[PDB]
């Protein structure tokens, strides 16, 4: 079987695409990696191969976060039924406060566009404010609540996850997880993921003060309730995922996974309506004409608003804000465009490649709404559009992320017109990357209409 050729980072994958081929390999200190690059390649590992490609590299240094085999979570959960479990109660529960999830959000953006509209028409850096309404929807699932936007418990839960995220970089946590061995010297212990665990002790305390107020004779109102009731069933059956210690981390993953991403996605959407003006004012149009200026937008308007779902879409296109995905890790031996690819091989989907393939998009480095329209003006969502993944592991938030972005989005523009304040640089439609590929950061002037 023969093997992938081969010898900040985005770029330079894309460079070795180029040069190598769509399936290419490295070796990423003491790990053999396999990157995937276009939908063929993708689809094949993750889909067809799906059985075999849904495991995570093991992390030793969790161990700090009190993980275990029965504890895991969902999202670095190892491929087996402590995910399983996991995966499919998320999925289902989800699903299920559909029937609201809705109405937390709608409640959330007439927030949002109450807390723009204090700043009136003054210049301001717009994050700060989306990743409140976006953490207060995961509050809202998780607990059942949601917090003011300056609850002072709420501001360092944010704060906390913002140094997180920091950790998940460094020198320090590659060699803590090369050799786990390290653990044993408490300063370096200490260290690696002091933030992460800060944020999980502050989660603690809202999470006893929800079991306090836990009313288990009715339905359950939230995901936290859901899991307790099922925490119940399980006493006695040391198989069960459904553990306290698991769900403080199945929480803390439905935080860490669905704050950044759809917050950042948002402040894409909101640069590129300042860069773009006149699909803005487009969008404005289909808004009055569908919705009005009174009503605040529901899920279904989304079906009579094609023009209003493509520029969404192509936001998260062009936005391309987790290039490279979530690494996987394959559990057997495969074949993917024709090569062999060995049973415990880091894979990296290059999902930016699939996202701005060339052979797919007509113009992929430009913002350009009608990569989802046809000449009749009708939505198409081309297959190439995966900026959540693909297979048994792909983006379990996506509904939700679905609801967030249209309710979000919808609402601010329907309420504001967004413009480059009036004496500074037309901000850069270049990403920084880091964790995520955010926007590089700029002010705009929201103005009622
Ligand atoms: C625009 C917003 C979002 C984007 C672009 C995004 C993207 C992704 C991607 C690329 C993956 C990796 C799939 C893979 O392993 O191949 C992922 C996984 C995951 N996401 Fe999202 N995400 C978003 C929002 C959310 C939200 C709102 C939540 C929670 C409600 C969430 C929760 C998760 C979880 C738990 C996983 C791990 C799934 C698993 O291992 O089974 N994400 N996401
Ligand atoms: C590729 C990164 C993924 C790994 N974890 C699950 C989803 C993301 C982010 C998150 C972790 O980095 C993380 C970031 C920030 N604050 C956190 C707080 C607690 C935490 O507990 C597991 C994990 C955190
Ligand atoms: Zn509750
Ligand atoms: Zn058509």
Same mark, same amino acid.
């Given at each position: 079987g023969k093997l992938p050729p081969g010898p900040n980072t985005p770029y330079c994958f894309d460079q070795l695409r180029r040069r190598f081929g769509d399936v290419f390999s490295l070796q990423l200190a003491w790990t053999p990696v396999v990157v995937l690059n276009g939908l063929a390649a993708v689809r094949e590992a993750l889909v067809?191969?799906?059985?075999?490609?849904?495991?995570?590299?093991?992390?030793?240094?969790?161990?700090?976060?009190?993980?275990g085999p029965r504890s895991q979570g969902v999202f670095l959960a190892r491929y087996g039924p402590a995910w399983r479990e996991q995966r499919r109660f998320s999925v289902s529960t989800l699903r299920n406060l559909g029937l609201s999830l809705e109405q937390w959000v709608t409640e959330e953006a007439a927030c949002l566009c109450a807390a723009f509209?204090?700043?009136?028409?003054?210049?301001?850096?717009?994050?700060?404010?989306?990743? #409140?309404?976006?953490?207060?929807?995961?509050?809202?699932?998780?607990?059942?609540?949601?917090? !003011?936007?300056?609850?002072?418990?709420?501001?360092?839960?944010?704060?906390?996850?913002? !140094?997180?995220? #920091?950790?998940?970089?460094?020198?320090?946590?590659?060699?803590l997880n090369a050799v786990p061995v390290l653990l044993h010297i408490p300063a370096l212990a200490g260290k690696v993921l002091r933030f992460q665990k800060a944020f999980l002790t502050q989660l603690d305390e809202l999470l006893t003060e929800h079991?306090?107020?836990?009313?288990?004779?009715?339905?359950?109102?939230?995901?936290?309730?859901?899991?307790?009731? !099922?925490?119940? #069933?399980? #006493?006695?059956?040391? !198989?069960?995922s459904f553990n306290d210690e698991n769900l403080r981390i199945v929480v803390a993953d439905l935080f860490s996974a669905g704050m950044v991403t759809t917050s950042t996605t948002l402040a894409w959407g909101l640069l590129l309506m300042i860069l773009h003006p006149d699909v803005q004012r487009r969008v404005q149009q289909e808004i009055d004409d569908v919705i009005g200026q009174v009503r605040r937008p529901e899920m279904g308007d989304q079906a009579h608003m094609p023009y209003t779902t493509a520029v969404i879409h192509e936001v998260q296109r062009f936005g391309d804000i987790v290039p490279l995905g979530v690494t996987h890790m394959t559990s057997r031996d495969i074949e993917v465009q024709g090569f062999r690819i060995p049973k415990g091989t880091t894979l990296i989907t290059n999902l930016s490649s699939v996202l701005k393939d060339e052979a797919v998009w007509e113009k992929p480095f430009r913002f350009h709404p009608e990569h989802f329209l046809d000449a009749q003006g009708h939505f198409v969502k081309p297959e190439a559009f995966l900026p959540f993944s693909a297979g048994r592991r792909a983006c379990l938030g996506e509904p939700l992320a679905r609801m967030e972005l249209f309710?979000?989005?919808?609402?601010?523009?329907?309420?504001?017109?967004?413009? @480059?304040?009036?004496?500074?640089?037309?901000?850069?439609?270049?990403? @920084?990357?880091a964790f995520l590929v955010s926007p590089s950061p700029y002010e705009l002037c929201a103005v009622p209409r």
């Open positions: 067809t191969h799906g059985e075999d490609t849904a495991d995570r590299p093991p992390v030793p240094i969790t161990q700090i976060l009190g993980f509209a204090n700043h009136s028409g003054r210049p301001f850096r717009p994050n700060g404010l989306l990743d #409140k309404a976006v953490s207060n929807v995961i509050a809202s699932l998780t607990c059942g609540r949601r917090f !003011e936007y300056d609850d002072p418990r709420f501001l360092r839960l944010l704060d906390l996850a913002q !140094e997180g995220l #920091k950790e998940e970089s460094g020198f320090l946590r590659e060699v079991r306090m107020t836990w009313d288990p004779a009715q339905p359950p109102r939230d995901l936290t309730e859901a899991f307790l009731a !099922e925490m119940e #069933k399980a #006493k006695g059956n040391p !198989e069960s309710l979000f989005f919808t609402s601010l523009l329907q309420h504001f017109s967004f413009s @480059v304040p009036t004496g500074q640089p037309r901000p850069s439609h270049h990403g @920084v990357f």
